[PDB]
Design a protein around this ligand. Structure first.
Ligand code: CA
Ligand code: CA
Ligand code: CA
Ligand code: ZN
Ligand code: ZN
Length: 159
């Protein structure tokens, strides 16, 4: 566990929006995903619309400028870079997935919670109950909650 952000106020910017979803729903999903982590750390997240943010949120398909191409529908859903300058922190979502607010397709909020974990410096957990487990699993709004392992992991980096 190398890089962590050495400041409490972190910015994000949505570079572009998936056509799979309502704009407001993309905004809300991402916002709620950041809140999951601010809930258990001293971190504060603010959305900006211009300039350089710490965490750029991108929807893209195939080769998209960073040596780690996406693979079409299925397989890899998203990836994110650990804390650092430039691409550090950034979270990319595979546009070849079909992003949703619900159980259909791939759930943006759940995926974003996982990716933002990486953006903050977390790796993968071996606990199949943890949001940082390496394989996506759909959990509804009644069931999602950060596992104790996720909480232990993030507080070992920030609190
Ligand atoms: Ca960045
Ligand atoms: Ca994919
Ligand atoms: Ca799509
Ligand atoms: Zn990428
Ligand atoms: Zn991951």
């Amino acid at each position: 566990m190398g890089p962590v952000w050495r400041k409490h106020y972190i910015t994000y910017r949505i570079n572009n929006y998936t056509p799979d979803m309502n704009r407001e729903d993309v905004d809300y999903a991402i916002r709620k995903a950041f809140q999951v982590w601010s809930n258990v750390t001293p971190l504060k997240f603010s959305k900006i619309n211009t300039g350089m943010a710490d965490i750029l949120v991108v929807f893209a398909r195939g080769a998209h400028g960073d040596d780690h191409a996406f693979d079409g529908k299925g397989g890899i859903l998203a990836h994110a870079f650990g804390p650092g300058s430039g691409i550090g922190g950034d979270a990319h979502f595979d546009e070849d997935e079909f992003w949703t607010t619900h159980s259909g397709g791939t759930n943006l909020f759940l995926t974003a919670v996982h990716e933002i974990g990486h953006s903050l410096g977390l790796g993968h957990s071996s606990d199949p109950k943890a949001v940082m487990f390496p394989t996506y699993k759909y959990v509804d709004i009644n069931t999602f909650r950060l596992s104790a392992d996720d909480i232990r992991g993030i507080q070992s980096l920030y609190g």
